[PDB]
Each structure stands twice: as structure tokens, then as C-alpha cells.
Design a protein around this ligand. Structure first.
Ligand SMILES: N[C@@H](CCCC[NH3+])C(=O)O
Ligand SMILES: N[C@@H](CCCC[NH3+])C(=O)O
Lengths: 486, 486
């Protein structure tokens, strides 16, 4: 390993004594992938007539030297093609230098396209150059993929494909939002008071002003300020930050899309979110009837819509109606399953919150088929409009697919006095030790007091959506550079 | 006094809650003011009475004209303004009486027939009229625009126009990049080692991992890892963070676009950046011959391309060639202009850096017409490829328009040994007190040691570009929520 690097470093030393070691004048004219497509059906004779001159640059992935003739496989950004090399065509000095290059080196050739006797498409090199020496060899392990994504990208074509699909899916989501009349906006990543979500923040400090500032846990409160300001339809796709546990399923920064539509409510949001996701599949995979991790996932069907208790009953039928309505039962049953209900997060827990907690331990992970869970207790929905007909319930949903939260939304709380009250109740929890409880945001209350129209809002987890569209088993597989441990 | 008004409005809200749902969310508008104004600009009183078009509108009540038998309100939705004509005959006495006590600012809604008033205005003959949300604070100095952008957005149509244009411009830039085959990517905003720029970082901490992290000053080093990985054309549009003073011309977070193209160099980058900017103007304004702050700005002309000393001579013709190549002259001349060259940023200053510093104090702010400044000293260009023909010079540019930096780019340093050396020289400066000097990044060097193809990279200041395109005088005028200033 070190001896290999040293040997390659010594070649680089010699290379510098005889010219420009890292030249930047070569201009490729074609892409391997495009040649493989456009000339799949052409044969030795067809190609000899066309006599197409090409110029390719990329990473040398294989090399075979056999006396007066040598073959290499070169990989550019698009794919692979062979270089065929003889001193007759490339000249003796280049041929000799070529033989001493290494797997990994960035190389470049001009030459005529042709087909080898074994059937492969290849370049009869008439010019051949080394553009950049690979000092470290390519490997020929489970975490290296993430610590050295650049290696994973060279060596695993599937990885390149996943990330091209991420990019296309996000463009497709933008198009969908734009067609539905939403204005894409940029709100701050630095907040003087974090909010818009239940999460532990990252804190930093502005030196000139001697001021604590928080990386955003969510843009929600800023996006609703825009609604007050009179933009009826806004959305934002960007990072949130959450300072919590690390795992294969957790990264400290992740991409959310939030959107807000004045004069809508949660029923509208659910229909709209459902349509968006289904179209996201059709765009990415040609169909909404797909598979994820070896199991059928039919996004073409209408999404299920269930209450919290409906969902517990569907997947944990042993629970009776009377049991799910009994405070004392719910507490002992939650204690049994490892939920400490004495924790400050539960300071304002009523019967609804206990049910929700039971749903999380029993049913949630089993929501394979797309399922909206509907009507959430007020005590855990501090930003959500209260029902007009049932006290203590909010017009809120969460969407689960494959057992993971993909979206969450609600009729927005536009009543400033209600909002102030619910903030004070969060501060109680926070004072009692609940680190995911919200801070009182006076500037936000002030904004609402200018008068905010009734509005519907939703956040979609772009990283999790992309997992489904690319059959990626963890969030780390859809992030170019996941954060890792030391 | 603003207080008595709030209190009075708060008391109306109290009465409102005793008689129904204060913040209803069931009203569904069917039309937009702007669309009605366009579609029926050409129609008259009789036309409209025949058509008899039933509409439903919701928005903010901006003016109210009251007479004995009737009332007119000017209501503003997301699209524009339309009049509501209100009589108790048609809306009912009880509603008419309530209406008289509603306030400028309230969010209101009507159904009714479209018609034209004798004074020529398009209006709704209301048959239903509702209050959707009480404005508790009344609608209405130079900094309030920024602390309360939501107020500025309601009251100033120019502000709305600027931000719609920002959004459109960014979509136009994404399209330009996509058409040129660049793949949009997302790299981390939390870096374990900050780099890619000369700036003071914001520092934070991940608690679960007990790990110091930095908010990114630039994504550059992560984008070049993707080039090692084999993506040929990548770009990213997102926030950087710099922990320094807030001014009218500075915000601690701002939007950059960086792009990288394998097998290109700085000449290519300059042509590409020039085309991008000119097309951005055509897209936004219909022409590249535009105006900024009352002065002609002709982006249609080819951009000037000057060396650092050429530019000093163009604006200060006193300076001779020998003066600008004399160390002792440059120092005394810099001392005269108030520049401290003893500062650690200048620890590795040679003649080039001194020239650059003189250019900053004499010519830079006068670069009104788009001007590329070209060929930068190595000691201030730690990430830029060195010239093949002139030692100590890098293939680097900065683009200035209206005296402000709009872009900066270079042929990328893909030589890992050169890069390691230049990093060690940065660490010297940093150890001697230069807080903008770079840290040594070993992981980045390791990536380059796998072999990176020659590449060209550039960063464009989106916020500053958008200023030019929208004729905004400061960066704060193109950010929805600028950071606090004192
Ligand atoms: N802010 C929410 C998404 C939007 C909820 C509706 N206002 C989140 O972080 O999940
Ligand atoms: N990282 C640079 C932009 C790209 C320079 C070329 N690699 C900046 O922050 O200005």
C-alpha cells in the first residue's frame, strides 16, 4: 500500500523532470456511453468505412500488455470504452511510456473507432497521453463507501446512477411545484430563535455582534411570514439541521421541501401530496407500481387514510376499544414497551398523546402501503389549526410509506393568541427538560398579528422520497457525503 | 397609540370569538384579481351584466370608501387588486353592520357578480362577505423593511416584483447550467474542516459525536471530490456562511453557485461565465444593454480582460511599469493609502500580492464595466493551477461589474504535492494570526492522490448577480430576511 504509493510517487518525480506532469490542454470530443449507444449495431466493416475519429479522456480501469500490442479500458463520466495501443500507431516512445502507466491514471487518446475480433468497441489510438498520475491505487469495506464516496463513484456504477436519479427527481419535483403555481424561495439558515419543528438545534455564534444563532431546524415560521406578506404559494427545498443521534438512518443535515398554499386545508394538502409523490414515481421509474427492497410498493392505488386509533387496531388487533380508551392501561402498556411517560416531553400528554405514543411503538413501522395518519392531539401539534368540531384535535397528518415518515402537514394555525398560548405551553416543557420543545418566538407572533390568511402547509422528506425512487436501503445511500464518526 | 389601536382591534377579535369561528378555513376562492383585470379589461357595463360572471375572491382589505347607501373596498390578493361593492340589500343588514367595523389590514372574502362601476373600475357586487382573519396590528423606517419584510411585502409592490424576479432569475440560471450538461448536486453544509475560501467560519458542535463542526465557507473541496469520482460537470447553488461584520453590503449567509467542468481551463471558464451573465440579463430584462442605479451598464459588449497591473494603470495612469514592479515603491505606496502590510495575511506576500493589494485600494471599485482581472499571484491563490510558462502566477480570474466581485474562477490545482505545499504555507499564515488562512485538509489531499483530471471551476455570487438584474442597491434588498444589524 505505502510501497505502491511510493513507487507511483517516484514515477511522478521522473514525469516532472521530462515535462508538464499535470497538463490541462486536452479536450475530449466524445463520450464513451454515447459511442456505445450510437454504434452498438455497427460491425468491423461498417466502422472501417465510417472511420470515425474520436477523442476520449478518463480513468484507466484495466490494462493488458502483450508485446507489440496492448489493450486498456478507460472510464469517463458516461461509461467505458477500450483503447487499443500499438507502437506503429502511437509511436515507440509513447508506447514505452504507456506500458509504465498505472490502473487509476487519468489518460487520454485520439484515434479511430473500431470493433475488435472479440466484439468490443474500441479506439485505435494514434495519440495517447497521461493527464494525471494516480498515486493511490484503486481497490479490487462497508463504511469506505461513505468516507470515500469518490472511490465508490469510480468503482461502483450503480452509485453514479443513484445520484443522477436524485438530481432528476428533484428537478421533477420543482417542475411539479412550478406547474401548480408555487414560487420557490430562499429563507435563512441562521435563526435567532430556532423553531418550526420538534428537534435539538445546532448553535453557533456571530462574533462581531456577540450573538448566539441557530442553524435552522425548519424554515416553517419564515415561510408563513411570506404568506402574511401576501405570497399565496411558496415552497423551499433545502437543508435542515438536527443535533441528535448518528445512525445509518440519521444524518445531521437532510433536505426537506416545505410548501404553503393560502386558502387551503389539510384535506387539500393530502390530495396534493399524494398526487405529487405518485407523479414523482411515474417520472423517475415510468410507473407508480414499483418495488422497494424486494417487496411490491403500489403507489398507483389510492393512499390509505386512517386515524391514529384506526391504525393501531389494524396492525395490533389484540388491543380492545376499552383498553385504548383507558389512561391507566395506556400508561402501563407504554411503560412495558419502554416508553417513559414521566419524561418532560409528556408533561402535557392527554389520552390522544398516549395513543400516538402507542401507535409509534406498535403500528408505525408496519405502514408499508402509503398511509396518511390523520387528526393529531393538540398537545403535540403546536403549529397546527384546531378542529372546529372536536376539541383537542388538530387538522394534521403524517404520511408513511415503507414504515417511514415521508411527509407531514396541516391546516396552519393563523390565530396569534392561540399560537402564543401554545408556545407558552412548549416553554413549560422546555423549562422541565424537553430539549425538543419549542422556544417562544415573539417576532413570529408579531407577524401573525398583522393578519394571516388561512393556509395549508406540508413538508416532504426529499431524501426519503429519493430512497424509494432509487431503491436505496438507507438515507446514507442518497447523500453524496454523509456525516460520519471518527 | 399604536397600542390603543392594537387593543381596540384585540377587543373586536374577542367579540368575534363569542359569535362564531374567528379564523375560518373553509372559504375557497375561485379567481384571482389580476386574471379578472386582464381577461375583462376590454369589457363594459352591459357586456358584464350579460356574462353575469360569478366570482369568489379573498385577500387583504387595503382601502375602504364609505357612503350613506353603499361601501367600496379595495381588496388585494396574491395577484393584484379588485374592488368589492357592498350594499346591505345584497349582503344583508347584519353583515353590512359588521363590515363597517372591520379594519384596513383584515383578510376578507366575497362572492358576487363581476361588474364595472361608473368610474370605470372592475368590481364584485358582493352577495356574500366574510371576515377570514382579523388584522390586530395596523398597516403603516429605513430598516423596518428588513425586520418586517412581511410588512414591506404587503405595502410595497416594488418589493414583490424584486423577489419574483429573483426566483425567475435563479430558475433561468439552473436552466442555463442544465442545458450545458451540468448536474446539480448537494454537498454538506457542515464541514469537519472548513475550506475552499479565505474567510472566518462559524463554529458549532455535534453533541452525540462530541465533534466540532464548521458551517461551510464554500463547497469547493467537496465538489472537486466529485470530479475525482468521475462526474465531469457538477454545480451547486446554496448558502455559504462567513463569520464577519454585518453592513449594507454584507450578510453572514449568502447564495453562491459553484460549478466544475473536467477538461476545461480558465479561458473556457471566462467565456462560459461571460455568456452565462449576458444571457441572465437578456432573460431577466429582455436585453444585455441595461441600467444600474441610474447609469448605463452594457453587458452586450465583450467583457474587458486585464492583468492586475493593466487595471491599476487604466484607472491611475500615473503609475509606471517600473514602479508597479518595485517592492519598496509598492510598500510605501500601500503605507500611504492606509494598508497594513505587516498583517499576517501578507506573511507570504511577494511583488504580485502587493500589486493585488494596490489594485484593491485604487482600481477595483472603479470597474464599472464588466472586467475580468487575470493571472493572480500564487501566494494568494492556494487552490489555483500554476501557469506552465510564468512561475508564481496562477490561471485565475475575478470578474467585477459595477465595482463588485460577481465571479471568480480558475484552472483547478489537481497536483496533490503542490496542494499539500500550499496548504502548509496557509497554516503558517494562520499560525501567525491570519484568521482567513486555510486549514490543512488531509482528506482532501487523499482524494487528489487518487488522480483528479484537469478541471476548471468557478463561483458566481448569485445575490450580487440578482442585484444587477433587479436594480437593487444593496445585497439586503435581494434577501427576503436579512440578518439583524445594529
Ligand atoms: N416544519 C415541518 C414541515 C411543515 C409542517 C406544516 N407547517 C417539519 O419540519 O416537518
Ligand atoms: N470557492 C470559491 C469559488 C470557486 C473557485 C474555483 N475553484 C469561492 O468561494 O469564491
Amino acid at each position: 500500500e505505502n510501497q505502491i504509493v511510493a513507487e507511483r510517487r517516484d514515477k511522478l518525480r521522473a514525469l516532472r523532470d521530462q515535462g508538464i506532469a499535470y497538463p490541462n490542454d486536452f479536450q475530449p470530443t466524445h463520450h464513451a456511453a454515447d459511442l456505445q449507444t450510437a454504434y452498438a449495431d455497427a460491425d468491423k466493416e461498417a466502422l472501417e468505412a465510417k472511420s470515425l475519429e474520436v477523442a476520449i479522456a478518463g480513468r484507466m480501469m484495466l490494462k493488458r500488455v502483450m508485446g507489440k500490442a496492448s489493450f486498456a479500458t478507460v472510464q469517463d463520466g458516461s461509461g467505458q470504452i477500450q483503447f487499443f495501443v500499438t507502437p506503429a500507431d502511437v509511436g515507440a516512445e509513447t508506447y514505452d511510456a504507456f506500458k509504465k502507466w498505472d490502473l487509476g491514471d487519468i489518460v487520454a487518446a485520439r484515434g479511430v473507432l473500431f470493433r475488435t475480433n472479440k466484439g468490443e468497441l474500441s479506439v485505435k489510438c494514434t495519440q495517447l497521453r497521461l493527464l494525471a498520475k494516480a498515486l493511490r491505487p484503486l481497490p479490487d469495506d462497508q463504511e469506505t463507501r461513505y468516507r470515500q464516496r469518490y472511490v465508490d463513484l469510480i468503482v461502483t456504477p450503480e452509485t453514479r446512477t443513484t445520484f443522477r436519479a436524485r438530481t432528476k427527481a428533484i428537478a421533477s419535483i420543482r417542475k411539479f411545484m412550478g406547474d401548480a403555481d408555487f414560487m420557490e424561495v430562499e429563507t435563512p439558515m441562521l435563526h435567532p430563535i430556532p423553531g418550526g419543528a420538534a428537534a435539538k438545534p445546532f448553535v453557533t455564534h456571530h462574533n462581531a455582534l456577540d450573538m448566539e444563532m441557530f442553524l435552522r431546524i425548519a424554515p416553517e415560521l419564515y415561510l408563513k411570514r411570506l404568506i402574511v406578506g401576501g405570497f399565496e404559494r411558496v415552497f423551499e427545498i433545502n437543508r435542515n439541521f438536527r443535533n441528535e443521534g448518528v445512525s445509518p438512518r440519521h444524518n445531521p443535515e437532510f433536505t426537506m421541501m416545505e410548501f404553503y398554499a393560502a386558502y387551503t386545508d389539510y384535506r387539500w394538502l393530502m390530495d396534493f401530496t399524494e398526487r405529487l409523490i405518485r407523479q414523482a414515481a411515474v417520472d423517475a421509474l415510468g410507473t407508480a407500481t414499483i418495488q422497494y427492497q424486494g417487496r411490491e410498493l403500489d403507489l398507483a392505488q389510492p393512499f390509505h387514510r386512517l386515524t391514529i386509533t384506526q391504525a393501531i387496531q389494524k396492525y395490533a388487533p389484540s388491543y380492545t376499544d376499552g383498553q385504548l380508551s383507558d389512561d391507566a392501561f395506556l400508561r402501563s402498556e407504554l411503560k412495558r414497551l419502554g416508553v417513559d411517560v414521566t419524561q418532560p416531553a409528556f408533561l402535557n400528554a392527554g389520552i390522544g398523546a398516549l395513543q400516538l405514543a402507542l401507535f409509534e411503538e406498535t403500528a408505525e413501522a408496519q405502514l408499508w402501503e402509503p398511509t396518511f395518519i390523520i387528526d393529531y392531539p393538540i398537545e403535540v401539534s403546536p403549529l397546527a389549526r384546531e378542529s372546529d368540531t372536536v376539541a383537542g384535535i388538530t387538522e394534521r397528518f403524517e404520511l408513511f410509506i415503507t414504515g417511514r415518515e415521508i411527509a407531514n402537514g396541516f391546516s396552519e394555525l393563523n390565530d396569534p393568541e392561540d399560537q402564543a398560548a401554545r408556545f407558552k405551553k412548549q416553554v413549560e416543557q422546555k423549562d422541565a427538560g424537553d430539549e425538543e420543545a419549542m422556544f417562544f418566538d415573539a417576532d413570529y407572533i408579531r407577524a401573525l398579528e398583522y393578519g394571516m390568511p388561512p393556509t395549508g402547509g406540508c413538508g416532504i422528506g426529499i431524501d426519503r422520497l429519493v430512497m424509494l425512487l432509487t431503491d436505496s436501503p438507507t438515507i446514507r445511500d442518497v447523500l453524496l457525503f454523509p456525516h460520519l464518526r471518527r
